[PDB]
Write a protein that binds this ligand. Structure first.
Ligand SMILES: Nc1ncnc2c1ncn2[C@@H]1O[C@H](COP(=O)(O)OP(=O)(O)O)[C@@H](O)[C@H]1O
Ligand SMILES: Nc1ncnc2c1ncn2[C@@H]1O[C@H](COP(=O)(O)OP(=O)(O)O)[C@@H](O)[C@H]1O
Ligand SMILES: Nc1ncnc2c1ncn2[C@@H]1O[C@H](COP(=O)(O)OP(=O)(O)O)[C@@H](O)[C@H]1O
Lengths: 174, 253, 97, 56, 488, 88
């Protein structure tokens, strides 16, 4: 969409974040790789390999003069692009949901090691998650199907539920 | 020239006459107790212990070398807004030498001593931390229930030994610290329990509880009459105007 | 990631590039190893974004694993899913048993 | 989110103004996501509840 | 550089600049400034032909920054001072300041009043015994997502003259408070100020306060309450002053605030940090169709651009003021007015405090466990500071009783509303549904003499279950609360 | 405005009474029967429950609910009640 600035007083996020919840074997990750091929700027992260400060942004001590300098995270490298998370549910909660300010305020506010900085991270986040138990239950609601909580689910604009249903003819054409 | 700016105030003979006149009174302990912090209501025995803390007891050094501590130390544990930190600020202001410290604003090396180079010498030397610079004085510890364990080691070392041994950077030195400690703490829960559980008083180990002479515990029990008395007392406190200043201007028995 | 400023140490999946990674005691593998294998079989990449360093690492690797059943020997009455500690997606990621 | 999905649908056509068709498609996407998120006991009722907004 | 004008995918670049003579000591760190000057090159002691650039400052201008280093000095011009006096003489400046805060956020009127009270602040007082009492209020907005709490944080950071915006995840103990760093050339430790040093005399805003670490939350207690940071690290011990008003936003531990769930389960904060906070605003979503349609129309008018027209027209109407005028009015009201209390106001304040503590007895009787939201003497000091800020809106040196009841209304709307969140109940419900039929009424004295004097139940069971039948809307109350009428 | 109160006692608002245990006070209150069915006195600052066991009323007057009466007596903080000595 379009980010909006109202009178220099109000800010409206313009990017769209999409969560794909589905059964395994439904090609959720190939779409993410296609967005990596397709988007102008595209950053990838998955699992326990994405830290809380691997995303967002971090701070570090330089070997020269031992001064605290900022380091751009995964969301800094997607300032006008797409950040893509694979296996979103199995990632740690501290590592899952450290991205609230980039996915809501489109900004990275940092106050550590004597450094205060309001970075811009206008990120479209495309996540790919799995239901509880490995398979989606059609008779259950969405809330206990996911391990995600209400605020991390609430920012996501489109939540695509995929169910691997056995069909005599859809499997044929597929 | 250098001026101290009077930590050890000079004593005129009129002051000595006043001191020896008031010493003969039977309730000089009460007068000097409620003379400490009239803005603070309650905690009268705590202020009596504060008075006996500022004039700490005599120290006796035996012939065999046992160091018998004459410095009384006080740990105040209890509910929020029971004015423990305000008593810490008062004994900070009214002492001859007072050094404050905080649970998350202290390091164990930063409390005793740190080794650093000197600019005009090009030689390594010690600079004393918080707990050594307050020698023959008081240390005002706030949020004592949440030290890092490294700072707990150094603090417990001073409470059991009164001297710190530094063996690093080619330096083998001992430093004396004959100082008093007043500290404030909250229980391990959000509010203090009236279930008198020994383990949920403080989160610190009982070994550090043992070196504190007076473990005062305060409960902000919810009342009507005494609560109204405290309410009217703090509204009398807020209605004070400092002398020589205009009404409604910012501040610059 | 290794402080030396972080650098990458390759894991045993990466050293078996265009080859075979024979893994023993596959049942009691770690959860970080689980979620890295969850991307490592199909997409053949491991993506690491930690602190200042972010990258994707291509690991074309064919996996041969030998996993003991947990809780003792294999039970012939139970299903093959019951005897193993693996979940559904990493079982579906394997070619054959 | 409906407003950004309508703006993105207008952006896909390279048209600087958003039409009512883009609002209809954005509402259709958001309603379809909400219906697919719901449990199957009430997907028929929820589909018939919002059918007047998407189809017309 | 300005964060609004950074390039894509890069970092803001620090550039070294110099001032000489009377241009020195004019700016506090953290301000936004426009600078005119020459772009010269100087050789540095630190490859080939690399000569580091700098800017020699010829001129400094900043509307957000005033009075250089703060000396409580009146540098406002005379006609602007007369205009500010006219604003202080306005009979409804309270609604003007309420509507000035968040014009593009529907509802949250009590939150806007608490924000204006935070921006004006209380009065710092000095006692002869060294007793320093707080002159700032800290407000925590706890509630569901989608209530625009972080937008209120951003607007508070825009309106306030000294303000910083921080995170809960992006924070640290040495980041919010002052840090101990090392100089490279001298190899000596020195203290560099953090986010609560850059916000000294102003507002610090914290986003996602529920998520900041347990060792990270508790370095703030002396900086919220004692208005100082006492640091004894690396051979340096000092007590820096940090007079920061704290505005924090948070969600509950569960994903949304659930009215069915107990308030103890939703909040895993300690009672200490809620004792330090002054407005504990718990906000919920009731899903009222009128409120949903009103917020829908308001956000539609914001997105289409018609809200730009409505705020631009209402500014010329005179019921709202902009960021710059309200910022300078905040600075003038903090630098000019510091009010006391009338003796008749103290009776009302102490009486309301003992009344709400007696209500806290009733709140903590039947639950038998301690409430997570406490009302202590520091909350009485909070209501005192609210009253003094309400006097500081209109430059009133005396906080009269008219400001006192509004302070009581704000405290009941925030903290008392937050704190108010087997066989006897069913047996009472069956006996009362069989006792009085549909469409007939019964006096409360009849129920008192037949259900308490009989000792069929307790009086607390009666008082709870009458409310329980009231919220079920099958049995309601009529005729000044003295009649119980079955609606049926 | 009357000379008796410009002398005898002074009027305290009702909200200030709760907290003052066992002290004599003189009041002006709107007389009312509350939801509980007991007698109460009300001002714009609040209300208090009273009991009329020990009253010595002024002879020559009428007392009905809705009267604004001068009430002299002692407040007790045990049950939140006000024991009235005299009413006029
Ligand atoms: N139309 C399709 N539907 C489902 N799966 C497909 C389709 N086309 C290809 N695939 C297969 O899906 C696999 C990738 O699935 P992946 O996204 O890794 O599963 P998961 O969603 O569990 O991560 C590919 O190996 C590909 O062969
Ligand atoms: N007379 C009094 N009685 C009780 N509490 C008071 C009194 N005067 C001030 N206080 C409150 O005590 C508080 C300080 O205690 P606190 O900061 O909670 O100590 P700590 O930081 O050790 O927990 C102040 O906020 C002040 O409002
Ligand atoms: N009353 C309102 N008026 C305008 N916009 C609103 C309102 N309520 C919510 N919003 C929008 O919804 C979003 C809510 O985000 P917010 O609740 O501030 O995040 P957090 O849950 O972290 O506090 C904002 O981006 C805002 O634009």
């Amino acid at each position: 969409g379009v980010p909006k600035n109202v009178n220099g007083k109000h800010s409206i996020r313009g990017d769209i974040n999409v969560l794909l919840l589905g059964d395994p074997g439904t090609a959720k990750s190939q779409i993410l790789k296609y967005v990596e091929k397709t988007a102008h700027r595209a950053v990838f992260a998955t699992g326990q390999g994405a830290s809380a400060v691997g995303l967002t942004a971090s701070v570090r001590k330089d070997p020269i003069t031992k001064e605290w300098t900022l380091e751009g995270g995964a969301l800094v490298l997607a300032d006008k692009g797409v950040c893509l998370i694979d296996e979103f549910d199995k990632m740690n909660d501290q590592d899952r949901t450290s991205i609230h300010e980039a996915m809501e305020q489109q900004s990275i506010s940092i106050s550590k090691a004597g450094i205060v900085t309001t970075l811009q991270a206008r990120c479209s986040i495309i996540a790919a998650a799995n239901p509880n138990g490995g398979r989606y239950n059609s008779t259950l609601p969405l809330a206990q199907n996911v391990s995600l909580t209400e605020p991390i689910l609430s920012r996501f604009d489109i939540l695509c539920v995929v169910r691997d249903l056995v069909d005599e003819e859809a499997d044929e054409r597929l | 020239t250098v001026y101290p700016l009077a930590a050890r105030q000079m004593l005129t003979d009129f002051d000595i006459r006043n001191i020896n006149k008031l010493s003969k009174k039977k309730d000089i302990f009460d007068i000097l107790s409620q003379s400490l912090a009239p803005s603070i209501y309650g905690h009268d025995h705590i202020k009596k212990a504060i008075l006996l803390m500022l004039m700490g007891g005599v120290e006796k050094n035996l012939e065999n070398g046992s160091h018998l501590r004459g410095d009384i130390n006080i740990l105040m544990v209890g509910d929020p807004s029971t004015a423990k930190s305000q008593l810490l600020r008062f004994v900070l202001n009214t002492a001859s030498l007072a050094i404050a410290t905080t649970g998350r604003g202290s390091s164990g090396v930063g409390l005793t001593a740190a080794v650093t180079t000197d600019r005009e010498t090009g030689e390594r030397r010690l600079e004393a931390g918080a707990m050594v610079l307050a020698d023959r004085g008081v240390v005002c510890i706030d949020e004592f229930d949440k030290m890092t364990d490294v700072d707990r080691v150094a603090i417990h070392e001073v409470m059991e030994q009164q001297t710190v041994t530094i063996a690093k950077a080619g330096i083998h030195t001992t430093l004396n610290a004959r100082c008093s400690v007043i500290a404030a703490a909250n229980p391990v829960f959000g509010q203090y329990d009236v279930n008198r559980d020994p383990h949920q008083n403080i989160a610190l180990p009982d070994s550090l509880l043992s070196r504190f002479d007076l473990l005062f515990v305060v409960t902000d029990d919810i009342n009507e009459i005494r609560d109204r008395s405290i309410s009217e007392h703090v509204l009398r406190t807020h209605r004070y105007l400092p002398p020589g200043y205009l009404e409604g201007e910012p501040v610059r028995p | 990631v290794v402080r030396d400023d972080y650098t990458i140490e390759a894991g045993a999946l990466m050293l078996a590039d265009n080859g075979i990674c024979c893994i023993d005691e596959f049942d009691k593998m770690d959860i970080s190893d689980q979620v890295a294998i969850h991307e490592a079989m199909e997409q053949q990449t491991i993506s690491i974004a930690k602190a200042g360093i972010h990258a994707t690492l291509n690991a074309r690797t064919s996996i041969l694993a030998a996993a003991n059943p947990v809780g003792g020997r294999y039970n012939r009455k139970l299903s093959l899913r019951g005897n193993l500690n693996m979940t559904a997606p990493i079982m579906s990621r394997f070619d054959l048993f | 989110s409906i407003l950004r999905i309508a703006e993105s649908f207008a952006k896909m056509r390279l048209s600087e103004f958003v039409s009512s068709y883009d609002l209809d498609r954005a509402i259709k996407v958001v309603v379809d996501s909400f219906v697919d998120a719901q449990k199957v006991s009430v997907r028929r009722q929820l589909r018939r509840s919002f059918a007047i907004y998407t189809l017309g | 550089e300005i964060p609004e004008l950074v390039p894509v995918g890069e970092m803001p670049r620090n550039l070294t600049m110099t001032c000489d003579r009377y241009l020195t000591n004019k700016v506090i760190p953290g301000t936004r400034v426009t600078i005119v000057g020459i772009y010269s090159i100087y050789n540095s002691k630190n490859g080939v032909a690399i000569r580091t650039p700098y800017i020699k400052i010829l001129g400094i201008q900043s509307d957000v920054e005033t009075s250089s280093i703060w000396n409580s000095v009146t540098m406002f011009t005379e006609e602007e001072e007369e205009e500010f006096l006219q604003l202080s003489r306005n009979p409804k400046l309270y609604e003007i300041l309420t509507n000035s805060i968040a014009p593009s956020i529907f509802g949250n009127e009590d939150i806007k009043k608490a924000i204006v009270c935070l921006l004006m602040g209380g009065s710092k007082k000095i006692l002869p015994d060294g007793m320093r009492l707080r002159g700032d209020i800290n407000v925590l907005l706890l509630g569901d997502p989608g209530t625009a709490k972080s937008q209120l944080l951003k607007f508070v950071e825009k309106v306030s003259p000294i303000a910083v915006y921080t995170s809960g995840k992006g924070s640290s103990a040495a980041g919010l408070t002052a840090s101990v760093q090392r100089d490279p050339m001298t190899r000596e430790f020195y203290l560099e100020g953090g986010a609560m040093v850059l916000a000294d005399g102003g507002v610090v805003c914290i986003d996602e306060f529920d998520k900041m670490r347990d060792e990270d939350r508790v370095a703030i207690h002396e900086a919220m309450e004692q208005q100082t940071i006492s640091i004894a690290k690396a051979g340096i011990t000092t007590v820096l002053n940090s007079r920061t008003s704290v505005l924090a936003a948070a969600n509950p531990i569960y994903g949304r605030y659930d009215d069915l769930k107990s308030p103890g389960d939703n909040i895993d904060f300690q009672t200490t940090i809620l004792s330090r906070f002054d407005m504990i605003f718990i906000v919920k979503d009731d899903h009222n169709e009128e409120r949903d349609i009103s917020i829908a129309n308001h956000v539609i008018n914001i997105h289409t651009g018609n809200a730009n027209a409505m705020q631009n027209q209402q500014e010329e109407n005179g019921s709202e003021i902009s960021i710059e005028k309200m910022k300078r009015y905040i600075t003038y009201c903090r630098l000019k007015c510091a009010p006391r209390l009338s003796p008749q106001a103290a009776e009302k304040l102490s009486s309301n405090f003992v009344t709400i503590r007696k209500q806290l007895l009733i709140n903590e009787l039947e639950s038998t466990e301690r409430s997570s939201i406490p009302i202590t003497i520091r909350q009485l000091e909070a209501i005192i500071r609210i009253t003094e800020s309400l006097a500081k809106l209109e430059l009133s040196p005396i906080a009269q009783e008219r400001h006192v009841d509004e302070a009581i209304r704000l405290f009941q709307a925030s903290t008392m509303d937050a704190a108010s969140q087997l066989s006897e109940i069913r047996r009472f419900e069956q006996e009362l549904k069989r006792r009085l039929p549909i469409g007939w009424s019964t006096s409360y004295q009849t129920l008192r003499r037949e259900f308490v004097d009989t000792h069929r139940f307790s009086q607390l069971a009666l008082d709870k279950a009458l409310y329980a039948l009231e919220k079920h809307e099958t049995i309601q109350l009529r005729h000044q609360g003295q009649n119980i009428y079955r609606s049926g | 405005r009357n000379e008796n109160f410009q002398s005898s006692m002074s009027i305290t608002p009702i909200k200030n009474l709760l907290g003052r245990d066992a002290q004599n006070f003189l009041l002006l209150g709107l007389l009312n029967k509350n939801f509980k069915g007991n007698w109460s006195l009300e001002d714009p600052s609040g209300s208090v429950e009273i009991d009329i066991s020990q009253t010595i009323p002024t002879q020559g007057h009428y007392y009905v609910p809705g009267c604004m009466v001068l009430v002299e007596g002692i407040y007790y903080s045990v049950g939140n009640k006000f024991h009235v000595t005299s009413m006029t």
